[PDB]
């Protein structure tokens, strides 16, 4: 069909055009009938990829922003076999506000949800997710609470890298990363796009899914530098 033809042409264009080296992420652009009708939030919502997985944490350079002082979380995560190489840098929110683009050295940034509102552009991967350093309630061995639970952190990061995300808006269209050139085959990409579409138009999955309003007018596929190829009209 058409859609398979579109990806095959974009993958080829990434191998033929010298401009499209260091083009990596593949995004679809969904144009909808109405504005999404959500006041802009700027916190990533997760979109669940079922069959395949976008990334694994070990793929990316991840930045962790924590409650200040960060020393405790840095030391615990760093000295634990499950999380030693998980992050690239662990810094306090104060350390980050003093640096203030800003994340141009990181593929991903996750912040302690407790310091999220203290953080300082539309089209940006590096918008921070929220995570917990500790389970709100652990049933196992309750006489001890972990302020920083490196398995639980890794869990959260696994679930962030393998899925994809979107940033709610009151916008006519919405972009969503669906694959990595060379890292995903044409079927894996396409499966990711359908998952994206199924979730985003499933009214049972509200409030995060089923957000698209007014139907889907079109869906294009794109890299940063390439042409916008129609996937569905």
Experimental method: X-ray
* Spatial contact of 179 and 6, defined as CB atoms under 8 Å apart: no
DSSP state string for 28-97: EEEEESS--------SPEEE---SS-S--GGGS-EEEEESSSTHHHHHHHHTSTTTTTT-SEEEEHHHHH
Indicate if the alpha-carbon torsion angle 163, 31, 217, 185 is positive or negative: negative
Cα separation, 108 vs 123, whole angstroms: 14
Using alpha carbons, list the distances in angstroms from residue 175 to 12, 73, 92, 204. Answer: 22, 33, 30, 22
Using alpha carbons, list the distances in angstroms from residue 67 to 74, 111, 113, 114. Answer: 11, 9, 9, 7
Q: Give the DSSP H/E element, type plus range, for residue 156.
A: helix 150-162
Q: What are phi and psi of 36, to 5 degrees?
A: -55, -20
Cα separation, 186 vs 6, whole angstroms: 10
Based on its alpha-carbon atoms, the radius of gyration of the chain, rounded to whole angstroms, reads 19
Q: Give the DSSP H/E element, type plus range, for residue 221.
A: strand 216-222
DSSP state of 116: G
| Residues whose CB is less than 8 angstroms from the CB of residue 38 and which lie 6 or more positions away in sequence, other chains included | 168, 169, 170, 211
Residues in the chain: 233
* Spatial contact of 68 and 218, defined as CB atoms under 8 Å apart: no
Q: What are phi and psi of 223, to 5 degrees?
A: -110, 180
* Spatial contact of 69 and 205, defined as CB atoms under 8 Å apart: no
Cα separation, 70 vs 93, whole angstroms: 9
């Amino acid at each position: 069909g058409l859609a398979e033809k579109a990806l095959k042409a974009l993958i080829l264009q990434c191998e033929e055009n010298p401009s499209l080296k260091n083009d990596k992420d593949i995004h679809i652009i969904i144009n909808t009938g109405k504005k999404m009708g959500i006041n802009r939030d700027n916190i990533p919502r997760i979109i669940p990829l079922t069959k395949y997985k976008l990334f694994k944490p070990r793929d990316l350079n991840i930045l962790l922003i924590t409650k200040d002082p960060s020393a405790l979380y840095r030391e615990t995560l760093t000295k634990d076999e499950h999380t030693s190489e998980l992050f690239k840098e662990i810094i306090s929110v104060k350390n980050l506000r003093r640096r203030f683009q800003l994340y141009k050295d990181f593929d991903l940034v996750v912040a302690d949800y407790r310091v999220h509102h203290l953080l300082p552009y539309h089209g940006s991967k590096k918008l921070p997710y929220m995570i917990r350093m500790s389970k709100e309630v652990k049933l196992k061995r309750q006489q001890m609470v972990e302020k920083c639970d490196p398995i639980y952190v890794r869990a959260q990061l696994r679930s962030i890298c393998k899925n994809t995300s979107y940033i709610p808006n009151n916008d006519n269209c919405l972009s969503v990363r669906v694959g990595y050139i060379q890292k995903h085959s044409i079927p894996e990409i396409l499966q990711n796009i359908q998952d994206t579409i199924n979730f985003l138009t499933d009214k049972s999955k509200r409030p995060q899914g089923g957000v698209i309003k007014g139907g889907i007018i079109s869906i294009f596929v794109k890299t940063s530098n390439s042409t916008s190829l129609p996937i569905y009209q």
